[PDB]
């Protein structure tokens, strides 16, 4: 078996243009330009490493390169060349390299180098170091035993380059990082995948790339399949209706509607009808967002909050400040960079206690359509010496992974004390890391930090430096008349489910002027409405088990004044 | 036909429609769409649930030629056979391909997996785009398949708890050639067979056959006993006597009665067989009533509004616009009657009740430690609606003030993700039970997840009377009125479910001490007639109550 390549050609891959260009100069040139090596009398062989996150299409890229070059290609997987009998797996590697040198020129894709060559330092078992030594000797066999006219190139891929032994890691000449696709790369991948498929003219790939911060190419491959399935859903329902009308015959049985129609589909079988030509509607792409989970979800993704600026009352000047400071750079980075405005990485919110300042950050996150990550107050402070700052640094690393990102801390007053006084030592060990991280990335990384505090005058001055959390904004408390819109939008987007109901919009205005509902914010009003609905449902459940006992129906979801009255008598501010 | 013989699988066919019927028959829709449609349907379920039956049903319903492939059906020659199958399948398109027990030959087997990969690629690239073939397979365990095959086989259909009609029809599909009487009524057997699967029904029918023919066997035994005079021939023991009687006779054959298995024998076999596919299965709806649980009227109402209301009227909460909580949290005295509280809610909800006995899910495995948690939620979703009980909640997620143990983090994050995924409409609610609220992971107590903390109270005096009555009945005058006063003792107030049992055991200690003193005195002073008496009077309970102290 000469191991011929396949047809996974470049037309199916995109978004890796920066990396793919380097391959043109590093792997294509030696493989078929070996005649240049022979004429120059210079052995020109190389080993290329493609290290990147899992599910980035590395196998597809290798297959595409092998198919495009057209030379022999021998893929090797790490588990497939491991034998229980100690002394035969090394024979397998030797035979693979002998085949490579014999069937020259060719390309070797030794997949999952991390699973075959670990660290020799901790390799107690002789097999682990034996494999590394075998690869080391085989690389020299490659470099020497060549016909001088047709060199061979070795391609390897992994996910943890640090896990590789330093010796084997050094042998691969150029290590290429295929990071998470950017907006342009994601748009290119989405448009390339939807190549042969008929697309609706209103499909906008740009804002497709815009709502997917943390997805990966494989995640996009699942998303396109989900959207295709949703498009086929309407055609399947149309087929079901066409079967119900084409051969009604009342029914051939009395089992169930899906089974009853599937009998008709079975009965037709050979009969065929023209299939309507449907184009994937843009609504289905947005529907597919929830159908495919992101790879970077479990790692504290904290999906974009659904709360909008409606949930917060008035504060127009505050919203203008936020739009000009954070939203604007994210919305139109080109326009702001035209003026040369470096996006400030830090903003500070101070004033009343932690009533609803979190919702302010969620509003910015939703407006910017960027990932939001929060922290449960001073949860980062632990008794151990080292892990106190390790979580802080992991936060910023994850924010690097999911760009853009929103890192909103909670109650910094207990996490970054003023270190001017010669008091406490562990606290300084964390604030120093915080200053370093803030100073590190504020320009174009897209990771903006939002402060949360209620005594800004007692916070340390080094953080309030410009570029860091130096933008101080005083978020107050919404007034009574502001609560009119808040209650209306809270009730409207939640229930609104069918004159004879218990909406009573005037009751919302009456509640908004409650004398005992003073210290309430966007979160407090939402909690109050939740409590009122819970009390109303309690009343419904109580009444349903008495009047029916002495059965009419599930009587009513009607919400009366007494529900809100008991809620306000059973609510505590802050 | 195919559907008529396999009913109760409405969800299976509904999920199968647009992934199977669409490409095989209406493949030209994709050709007009210009989209290749490659998938591998992952079918999972215990043996006997009907994987082979549904496979042969789709094969007989499509009407095209089908090749029956199983695990034993096919180091290079079997690979060539699979190439022969696949190349003709793509050549003879459209066609249906199914590989039964695909797990058993996808572990030679690695070469089989490589052949399957190459075949799926060649189907992807060589299809006419208008008449394709679908690689269908069924596995008794999804975990056994290769992870690469797992990712490639991203299409799944859940064959969960078999329907009553399905169970009845598969019972009849077990009894084709069985010589049966006319008294069999398969309808009631399925209705009283909630917690069994196809293999379990096979066990049930085999036990029924064995018990039915036990009538023939002991008929022969009685005939042999009456045939041979002189009382008996073996004085050792009854079964050895039966075997000795059967040995000598041997060749003197008799007309074996043409016995037909009766429904009564099936009823007898139902009780004997109870595997439940687990330690408890899904523990079919408990019979505990709210009269069993003592008082807790406020607690009862809180459980109503928190869990029972969402279960009874799922649309009501959506109409009010409140997402139901992920479940409840229980705390207070030790685990005396928390299971009663959970079982009462399960019984009123009339849903499945699955409980985990604390530090049992965690074993020496670390890879499967989270897999067990995932599988529990998967089965609960399959058997929706269901309630899940976690007593001794401390055994899984103590306070993570110091997030050091990597396995603990892997467990807690996975458990949080799974419980958060399905808490609103899927009908699965998880019950958390422990002794102290403050020894649980903090990332659970906040709203949305298990943030509803409910305090379970100690049993009352009327409950204490019944608690004493049950245990004292198990110890066997009864003196029920005396036990009432014992339960009404002021010094006995500071007890709980565990405490009364230890109090009774200590009272037995004083009683037997008095018995020893009487035995010594009567034999020596007052011969050794071992006049043992277990009667317990007020002196014993009073002395034990004074000698026993309340717990904390």
From TrEMBL, chain B:
ADP 1 binds at residues 7, 48, 50-52. Mg(2+) 1 binds at residue 52. GO terms for molecular function: ATP binding; ATP hydrolysis activity; preribosome binding; RNA binding. Residues 37-163, 324-460 form the AAA+ ATPase domain. Keywords: ATP-binding, Metal-binding, Nucleotide-binding, Peroxisome biogenesis. It catalyses: ATP + H2O = ADP + phosphate + H(+). Mg(2+) 2 binds at residues 52, 100. ATP 1 binds at residues 5, 7, 47-53, 124, 140, 151-152, 199, 202. One of its GO terms (biological process) is ribosome biogenesis. GO terms for cellular component: nucleus. ADP 3 binds at residues 294, 335, 337, 339-340. Mg(2+) 4 binds at residue 339. It comes from the Eukaryota. Mg(2+) 5 binds at residues 339, 391. Mg(2+) 3 binds at residues 52, 121. ATP 2 binds at residues 7, 47-53, 151-152, 202. ATP 4 binds at residues 294, 335-340, 435, 446, 449. ADP 2 binds at residues 294, 337, 339-340. ATP 3 binds at residues 294, 335-340, 435, 446, 449. Belongs to the AAA ATPase family. This is Peroxisomal ATPase PEX1. It comes from Chaetomium thermophilum (strain DSM 1495 / CBS 144.50 / IMI 039719) (Thermochaetoides thermophila).
């Amino acid at each position: 078996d000469r191991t011929p390549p396949t047809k996974v050609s470049i037309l199916d891959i995109a978004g890796v243009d920066d990396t793919l260009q380097r391959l043109l100069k590093e792997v294509w040139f030696p493989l078929r330009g070996g005649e240049a090596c022979e004429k120059m009398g210079y052995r020109y062989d190389n080993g290329v490493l493609l290290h990147g996150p899992s599910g980035c299409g590395k196998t597809t890229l290798a297959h595409a390169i092998a198919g495009s070059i057209g030379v022999a290609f021998i893929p090797v997987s790490a588990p497939s060349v491991i034998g229980g009998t100690s002394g035969e797996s090394e024979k397998n590697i030797r035979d693979v390299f002998d085949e490579a040198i014999r069937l020259a020129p060719c390309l070797i894709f030794l997949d999952e180098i991390d699973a075959i060559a670990g660290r020799r330092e901790s390799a107690n078992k002789g097999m682990e170091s034996r494999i590394v030594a075998e690869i080391m000797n085989g690389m020299d066999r490659i470099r020497q035993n060549t016909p001088l006219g047709k060199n061979v190139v070795v391609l390897a891929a992994t996910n943890r380059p640090e896990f590789l032994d330093p010796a084997i890691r050094r042998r691969f000449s150029v290590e290429i990082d295929m990071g998470m696709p950017s907006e342009r790369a994601r748009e290119q991948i989405l448009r390339s995948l939807t190549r042969d498929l008929s697309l609706a003219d209103d499909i906008n790939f740009k804002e497709l790339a815009k709502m997917t911060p943390g997805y990966v190419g494989s995640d996009l491959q699942y998303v396109v399949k989900a959207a295709v399935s949703e498009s086929f859903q309407a055609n399947i329902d149309s087929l079901l209706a066409q079967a119900r009308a084409k051969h009604p015959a009342d029914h051939l049985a009395n089992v169930s509607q899906p089974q009853r129609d599937w009998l008709l589909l079975e009965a037709h079988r050979d009969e065929e009808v023209s299939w309507p030509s449907t184009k994937i509607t843009m609504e289905q792409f947005r529907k597919a967002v929830s159908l495919v989970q992101p790879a970077s979800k479990r790692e504290g993704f904290s999906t974009i909050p659904d709360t909008t600026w409606s949930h917060v009352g008035a504060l127009e000047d505050v919203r203008k400040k936020l739009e000009m400071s954070i939203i604007g750079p994210i919305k139109n980075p080109e326009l702001f960079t035209r003026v040369g405005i470096k996006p400030a990485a830090g903003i500070l919110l101070w004033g009343p206690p932690g009533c609803g300042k979190t919702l302010v950050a969620k509003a910015v996150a939703n407006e910017s359509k960027a990932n939001f990550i929060s922290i449960k107050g001073p949860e980062l402070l632990n008794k151990y010496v080292g892990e106190s700052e390790r979580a802080v640094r992991q936060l910023f690393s994850r924010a690097k992974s999911s760009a853009p990102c929103i890192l909103f801390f909670d109650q910094m007053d207990a996490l970054v004390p003023r270190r001017d006084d010669s008091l406490s030592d562990a606290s300084a060990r964390v604030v120093n890391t915080l200053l370093t991280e803030l100073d590190g990335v504020g320009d174009r990384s897209g990771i903006y930090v939002i402060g949360a505090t209620n005594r800004p005058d007692m916070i340390d001055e080094a953080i309030r430096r410009p570029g860091r959390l130096g933008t101080s904004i005083y978020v107050g408390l919404p007034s009574a008349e502001d609560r009119v819109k808040i209650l209306k939008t809270l009730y409207r987007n939640t229930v609104k489910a069918p004159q004879h109901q218990g909406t009573t919009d005037a009751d919302l205005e009456k509640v908004a002027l409650d004398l005992r509902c003073t210290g309430f914010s966007g979160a407090d009003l939402g909690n109050l409405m939740q409590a009122a609905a819970q009390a109303c449902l309690e009343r419904v459940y109580t009444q349903r088990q008495q009047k029916r006992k002495e059965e009419e129906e599930e009587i009513e979801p009607v919400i009366t004044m007494e529900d809100w009255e008991k809620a306000l008598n059973e609510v505590k501010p802050s």
